[PDB]
Design a protein around this ligand. Structure first.
Ligand code: HEM
Length: 151
């Protein structure tokens, strides 16, 4: 369970992210795809992209980065009381998109890296640890839903 202090650190940096949702979403998905190419293969929508420049030039990829970070932001602002937001996401990601929990770990790493690059003064080690805990909570709770469903 995150403390109130930990949530403050998470949401303080997240308020910075929200000044440029789409740029962050692009950097995070690109980092995910470059670092873990099996992830790109899960997107029929993106698997034609073969270079980082092609990824950066895709408006559809940028739109999807906004979709992703908008959903994550709504979850983080619930400070753990996020059951209603996570159910539909876990259901789609387990049963329709067929995303393993491990790939959620990979996107969490990409998020943390991009936040560190873009917001170092609001993303020192205390805030990195708190965000790690927030994303771990996200993963834990999705994984319990996956287990229920047999994924
Ligand atoms: C922070 C983690 C993530 C969040 C918040 C997130 C959120 C979303 C949202 C809101 C959608 C659209 C609604 C829905 O289908 O549920 C979506 C679609 C999708 N997500 Fe994620 N997602 C995450 C991680 C991932 C990862 C790691 C993968 C793949 C490796 C993935 C693959 C997909 C796919 C394939 C779709 C459908 C895209 C399309 O063809 O339009 N998601 N995601």
């Amino acid at each position: 369970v995150l403390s109130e202090g930990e949530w403050q650190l998470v949401l303080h940096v997240w308020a910075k992210v929200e000044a440029d949702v789409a740029g962050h979403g692009q950097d995070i998905l690109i980092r995910l795809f470059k670092s873990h190419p099996e992830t790109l293969e899960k997107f029929d929508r993106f698997k034609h992209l073969k270079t980082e420049a092609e990824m950066k030039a895709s408006e559809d990829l940028k739109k999807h980065g906004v979709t992703v970070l908008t959903a994550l932001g709504a979850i983080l602002k619930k400070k753990g009381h996020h059951e209603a937001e996570l159910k539909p996401l876990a259901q789609s990601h387990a049963t329709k998109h067929k995303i393993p929990i491990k790939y959620l770990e990979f996107i969490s790493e990409a998020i943390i890296h991009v936040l560190h690059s873009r917001h170092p003064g609001n993303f020192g080690a205390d805030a990195q640890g708190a965000m790690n805990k927030a994303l771990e909570l996200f993963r834990k709770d999705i994984a319990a839903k996956y287990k229920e469903l047999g994924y």
